[PDB]
Structure formats: structure tokens, C-alpha cells
Amino acid sequence: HMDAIKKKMQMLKLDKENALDRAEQAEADKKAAEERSKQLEDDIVQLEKQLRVTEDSRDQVLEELHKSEDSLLFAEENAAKA
Amino acid sequence: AGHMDAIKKKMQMLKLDKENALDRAEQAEADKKAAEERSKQLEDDIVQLEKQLRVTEDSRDQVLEELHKSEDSLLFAEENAAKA
């Protein structure tokens, strides 16, 4: 009869629509994750920049410490020799 | 074939649309999990990078402090000579 069939056909359309709604939701979550990733990536680039800059500054000051330390020693020596 | 053959071809068809949509829903769920796992990975990356940045900045501050102390000490010596 046209009942059992029409109802089954309707159940099949319904089931498809539900799967489509599930895909829609997952897709929405995918894009939220992707946009967070983009923010994290920018954050990383920036913190990497800060790291390189800090490393190079650290090196400069370390080298300046040695020179100062040396100059101090030479000042003590010279005073003592005077 | 006018008859149930034609109406059976439809049923099959609707079964297909359903199967395809289910398939696509599964694949969408898989891409979502993948995108989120990429995010977690970058979070791990930033946690690690920040640890390295905190160490380097603390090290740099410690050397800089030491340097300022040494510099002041030397300057004293020099101002003393300059003033004599």
C-alpha cells in the first residue's frame, strides 16, 4: 500500500536532514577551531620574535659585563701599582 | 516498467541520499576532530615556547642587573680619578 511506503520514504528524508544537521554543527566547530589556530599561530610568531630579540640582547649584555669586569680589574691593578 | 519497479528505484535513491549524508556527517566530525587536534598542538607549542622565553628573559635580566652593578662600581673609580 501507499502508506507504509510513503511513511518509509518520509523517514528516509528525515534521516538525511538529521545527518545534514550533524554535518552542519561539526563544520561550525571545525571553523571555530581553525580561527583559534590562526590566533595561536600569530601569538607564536610574536613570542618567537621576542625570544630572538631577548637572546641577542642577552648576548650583548653578557659581553658588556665581561668588559666592565675586566676594566674594573685593570683599575684595581693600576691603583695598586701606582 | 511502470509499476513497483519505478517506485523501488525511488526507495533505493532515498536510501542513497541518506547514506551519503551520513557519510558526510562522519567526515565532518573527523575534520572537526583534526582541526581541534591542530589547536591543541599549537597550545603545546606555545606552552613550550613561553617556558623558553621566561628562562631567557630571566637570564637576561640577571646579567643586566649584574652589569649595572659592575658599571656603577667602575664609574665610582673613574669619577674619583676624574675629580683628582
Q: What is the dihedral of CA A72, A74, A78, A80, to 10 degrees?
A: 70
- Which residues of A are less than 8 Å from B18 in CB distance? 12, 15-16, 19
**Distance between CA A5 and CA A11 in Å, rounded?**
10
Query: Cell numbers of A3, please?
Result: 502508506
Q: Across the interface, do A61 and B59 touch by the CB < 8 Å criterion?
A: no
CB B79 within 8 A of CB A76: no
CATH class of A1-82: mainly alpha
Method: X-ray
Q: Across the interface, do B29 and A22 touch by the CB < 8 Å criterion?
A: yes
- What share of residues in chain B are helix, strand, coil (percent, to 5)? 95, 0, 5
**Distance between CA A43 and CA B45 in Å, rounded?**
11
Specify the CATH number for B1-84; select among 1.20.5.340, 3.40.50.720, 1.10.357.10, 1.10.10.60: 1.20.5.340
- In chain B, where are the structural domains located? 1-84
Cβ count within 10 A of residue A30? 19
- Which residues of B are less than 8 Å from A68 in CB distance? 67, 70-71, 74
Does B82 lie at the interface with A, CB-CB under 8 angstroms? no
